Amino acid sequence: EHTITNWSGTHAVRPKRFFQPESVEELEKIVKEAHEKGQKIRPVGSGLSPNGLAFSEDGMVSLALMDKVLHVDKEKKQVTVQAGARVQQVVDALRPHGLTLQNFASISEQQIGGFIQVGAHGTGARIPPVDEQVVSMKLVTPAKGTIELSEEKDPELFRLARCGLGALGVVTEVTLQCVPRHKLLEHTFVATMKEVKKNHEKLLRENKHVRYMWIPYTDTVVVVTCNPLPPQYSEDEKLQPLRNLLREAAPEVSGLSFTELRDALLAVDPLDTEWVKRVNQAEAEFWKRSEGYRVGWSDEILGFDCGGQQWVSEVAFPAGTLEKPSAADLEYMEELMRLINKEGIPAPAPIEQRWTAGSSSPMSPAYSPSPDSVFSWVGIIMYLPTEDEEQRKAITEAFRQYRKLCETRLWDKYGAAEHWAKIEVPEDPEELEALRERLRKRYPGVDKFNKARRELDPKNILSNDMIDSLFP
Numbered sequence: 158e159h160t161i162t163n164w165s166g167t168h169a170v171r172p173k174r175f176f177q178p179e180s181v182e183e184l185e186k187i188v189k190e191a192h193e194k195g196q197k198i199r200p201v202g203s204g205l206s207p208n209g210l211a212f213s214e215d216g217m218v219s220l221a222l223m224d225k226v227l228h229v230d231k232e233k234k235q236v237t238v239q240a241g242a243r244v245q246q247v248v249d250a251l252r253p254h255g256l257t258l259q260n261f262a263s264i265s266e267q268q269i270g271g272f273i274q275v276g277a278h279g280t281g282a283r284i285p286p287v288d289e290q291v292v293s294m295k296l297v298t299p300a301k302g303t304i305e306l307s308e309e310k311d312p313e314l315f316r317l318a319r320c321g322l323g324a325l326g327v328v329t330e331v332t333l334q335c336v337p338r339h340k341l342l343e344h345t346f347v348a349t350m351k352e353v354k355k356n357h358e359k360l361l362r363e364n365k366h367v368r369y370m371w372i373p374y375t376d377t378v379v380v381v382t383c384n385p386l387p388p389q390y391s392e393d394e395k396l397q398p399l400r401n402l403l404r405e406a407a408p409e410v411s412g413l414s415f416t417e418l419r420d421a422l423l424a425v426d427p428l429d430t431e432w433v434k435r436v437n438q439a440e441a442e443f444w445k446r447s448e449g450y451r452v453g454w455s456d457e458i459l460g461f462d463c464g465g466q467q468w469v470s471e472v473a474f475p476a477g478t479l480e481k482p483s484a485a486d487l488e489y490m491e492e493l494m495r496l497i498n499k500e501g502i503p504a505p506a507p508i509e510q511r512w513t514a515g516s517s518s519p520m521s522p523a524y525s526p527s528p529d530s531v532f533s534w535v536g537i538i539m540y541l542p543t544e545d546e547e548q549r550k551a552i553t554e555a556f557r558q559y560r561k562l563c564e565t566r567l568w569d570k571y572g573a574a575e576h577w578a579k580i581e582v583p584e585d586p587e588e589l590e591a592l593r594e595r596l597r598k599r600y601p602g603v604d605k606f607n608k609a610r611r612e613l614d615p616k617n618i619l620s621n622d623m624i625d626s627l628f629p
């Protein structure tokens with residue numbers, strides 16, 4: 158009944174103790190007493206991380222009841238919000254103030270604490286991950302009680318703690334640098350690899366938001382651009398290629414959304430590469446029939462409800478600077494498509510490619526000493542289309558092998574770092590040792606992160622098995 162499960166049902170936990178304080182004073186008392194008794198209190202937001210980063214069998218603390226907007230600074234365009242607020246609640250609260258977030262990370266149901274603590278991101282070559290939106294914060298620490306951090310109050314600890322994986326304190330309050338509320342024009346169109354390469358450098362720098370959806374085993378890339386705003390196909394015709402392909406396989410089809418159609422297609426034979434080729438070809442035809450323009454407020458256009466169950470792996474890797482472009486982002490995709498074909502991986506769509514500016518947070522996968530660094534983020538996916546336990550098991554193993562080939566063939570070469578909400582802990586002790594050392598190479602600040610953990614959480618009450626495994 159009080160099992161906590163993630164979005165895709167890949168991780169679940171029943172914590173022995175579950176705390177949901179209604180005030181800072183109540184939280185301060187929970188942290189002091191947990192510290193005195195040496196009892197685990199892993200901070201949890203919405204609990205939606207694909208890897209169950211927030212999960213603990215021992216103890217979890219939720220700030221969901223502490224979700225108020227405390228202050229809007231009209232002149233500085235800043236909001237101070239309790240960390241238990243969902244992104245959606247902040248968006249709704251900012252609407253009458255004419256403000257919005259600089260960027261979004263797909264789902265509006267995540268909490269502000271969970272959003273910043275993993276270094277979540279959207280797309281936009283000139284826009285950093287969301288940990289860089291943080292101007293100041295308050296943190297309840299086991300060692301020092303409630304502390305305030307900002308560029309003016311212990312900047313070094315601030316830049317660690319704001320992207321701190323819940324390991325440095327319970328965030329109570331965050332001040333975010335907002336931008337004016339604004340409409341975006343979203344353009345969806347298809348291109349080949351060749352057309353993408355031709356326009357790529359200029360497209361990234363001349364469009365506020367650019368995202369590619371690569372369709373494996375096709376030469377279709379779906380390009381989506383969004384910019385501030387100063388033959389039409391029916392839904393039935395857009396879905397026709399997927400509906401026709403599903404009728405061809407041994408079986409109301411007409412009731413299914415696009416995402417339910419892709420799931421029902423993949424469910425036929427999810428690990429058969431020749432079948433996945435046909436599913437991906439049908440999906441490419443859907444996207445060709447989906448070219449066009451939408452207009453909406455930035456939160457509506459940049460936000461997605463998603464909905465499927467899936468395995469995801471996303472890596473950040475450097476792709477030069479605004480002034481000195483790098484080809485590493487297109488070269489990565491070239492090698493990844495070659496790897497999928499060469500190895501016969503039943504890779505469904507999309508392989509999602511996004512861009513951020515660098516972050517000054519040392520634990521950001523997109524950490525850079527340069528503010529105008531550009532990072533490419535590449536997400537691979539396999540869907541879990543049914544609750545069939547044997548099929549889920551087979552796809553889980555296929556995804557592990559798919560990710561492992563990217564890790565061994567590409568990640569070190571490109572300096573790729575895994576998203577903190579998507580990274581899985583290996584069980585093999587040699588692979589775990591190897592990952593711990595890889596994290597020290599990918600993250601210059603790992604030793605300083607552990608130093609801050611010893612300083613703020615000496616009895617290690619904020620860390621779960623995952624944190625202990627990655628950062629011994």
Ligand SMILES: Cc1cc2nc3c(=O)[nH]c(=O)nc-3n(C[C@H](O)[C@H](O)[C@H](O)COP(=O)(O)OP(=O)(O)OC[C@H]3O[C@@H](n4cnc5c(N)ncnc54)[C@H](O)[C@@H]3O)c2cc1C
Binds near residue numbers: 199240261274277
């Ligand atoms: C369908 C889906 C789509 C996604 N799309 C994107 C995307 O586009 N871009 C992207 O970057 N990410 C994306 N994510 C990942 C998501 O942004 C992260 O998993 C995020 O951490 C979820 O927020 P949450 O409130 O569920 O956090 P949780 O999973 O509950 O917690 C995440 C981390 O925050 C810590 N934490 C939470 N609250 C506090 C607090 N008050 N104080 C201290 N630590 C705290 C936890 O200990 C944990 O380390 C997606 C996830 C899903 C399921």
